[PDB]
Design a protein around this ligand. Structure first.
Ligand SMILES: Cc1ccc(N2C(=O)C=CC2=O)cc1C#N
Ligand SMILES: [Cl-]
Ligand SMILES: [Cl-]
Ligand SMILES: [Cl-]
Ligand SMILES: [Cl-]
Ligand SMILES: [Mg+2]
Length: 346
């Protein structure tokens, strides 16, 4: 049952992996990554060795969360898990976890670097993001970190979502940084309990950038970015103000002079009118009123790609562990069980 493993030191790290994985070559604070050839499947793969997976309760729970999420995702537009392994022969000697995925090449940044695309390409790329999001959201999973560097794209314009948000620090979100430019305002400023609607805001920011070739809200800090957002979509009325928990945040918003929603046809000059209409439905300040992924797939902008018989939902996903309090060794045992029960895809 257990494959034979072989050891080797590559760039200060000891790697112990099954013989099927050959010609390892380093490529990249959560772990180290090597490219390899998988002789069992013929795929070029990424092998990630997790760093200190069980060093604290918070870190042990995060390791379990990542493995549970990756084992669930089975969709053409979402990254999936090809393999997971440990060299340990028992729970008592279990310390290291390795994750194997398809090796990804270019991301959406490269396809879009200072450059804008034709309308048919925008339709196909955004269609695939929304198809993957319908699947993710149907399992009550929120990505939280959608942005161009987290979207893999090949030469045939085919797209996969990767790098789910596993719960980024304060410093990573400070200043003139792409890590914040795609985030919905309610999460950027901690206005309220957020939900899956945050991902639709991010899609609107991505779609705008594909149409213009430029970042939509390139703020120099949180407040500068909020000002750019409210200039486009308008300042909020009392209905949304009542939904913001912090009195300080409400006071700050009301200190700003009121502004109307702008004409999106005069911002996205020359865009397909159906693209303008869809952007107006995604980039809505009140998250309760944003279009959902399932609704957006039926919008006329996607008429040439929409097939309601080929837009699947996910199997139900059990997240009850998120509210559970366990010790390090208990999270470690749960992770071990998930490693040993893995069944590879066809
Ligand atoms: C400022 C701006 C507005 C609109 C656009 N644009 C096109 O050129 C085609 C669709 C669209 O929105 C680009 C820029 C740029 N750069
Ligand atoms: Cl092997
Ligand atoms: Cl995949
Ligand atoms: Cl181990
Ligand atoms: Cl990015
Ligand atoms: Mg990433």
């Amino acid at each position: 049952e257990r494959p034979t493993f072989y050891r080797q030191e590559l760039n200060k790290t000891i790697w112990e992996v099954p013989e099927r994985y050959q010609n390892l070559s380093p490529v990249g604070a959560y772990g180290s990554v090597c490219a390899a050839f998988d002789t069992k499947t013929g795929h070029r793969v990424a092998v990630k060795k997790l760093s200190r997976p069980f060093q604290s309760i918070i870190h042990a729970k995060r390791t379990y969360r990542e493995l549970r999420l990756l084992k669930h995702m089975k969709h053409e537009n979402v990254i999936g898990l090809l393999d997971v392994f440990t060299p340990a022969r028992s729970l008592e000697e279990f310390n290291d976890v390795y994750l194997v995925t398809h090796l990804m090449g270019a991301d959406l940044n490269n396809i879009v670097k200072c450059q804008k695309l034709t309308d048919d390409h925008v339709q196909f790329l955004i269609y695939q993001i929304l198809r993957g999001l319908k699947y993710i959201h149907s399992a009550d999973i929120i990505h939280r970190d959608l942005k161009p560097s987290n979207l893999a794209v090949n030469e045939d314009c085919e797209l996969k979502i990767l790098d789910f948000g596993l719960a980024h620090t304060d410093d990573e979100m400070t200043g003139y940084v792409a890590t914040r430019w795609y985030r919905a305002p309610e999460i950027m400023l901690n206005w309220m309990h957020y939900n899956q609607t945050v991902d639709i805001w991010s899609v609107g920011c991505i779609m705008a950038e594909l149409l213009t070739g430029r970042t939509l809200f390139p703020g120099t800090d949180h407040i500068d970015q909020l000002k750019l957002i409210l200039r486009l979509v308008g300042t909020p009325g009392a209905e949304l103000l009542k939904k913001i928990s912090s009195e300080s945040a409400r006071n700050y918003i009301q200190s700003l002079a009121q502004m109307p929603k702008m004409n999106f046809a005069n911002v996205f000059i020359g865009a397909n009118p159906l693209a303008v209409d869809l952007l107006e439905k995604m980039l809505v300040l009140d998250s309760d009123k944003r279009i959902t992924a399932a609704q957006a797939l039926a919008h006329a902008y996607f008429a040439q790609y929409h097939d309601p018989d080929d837009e699947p939902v996910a199997d139900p996903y059990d997240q009850s562990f998120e509210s559970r309090d366990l010790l390090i060794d208990e999270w470690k045992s749960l992770t071990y069980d998930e490693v040993i029960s893995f069944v590879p895809p066809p």
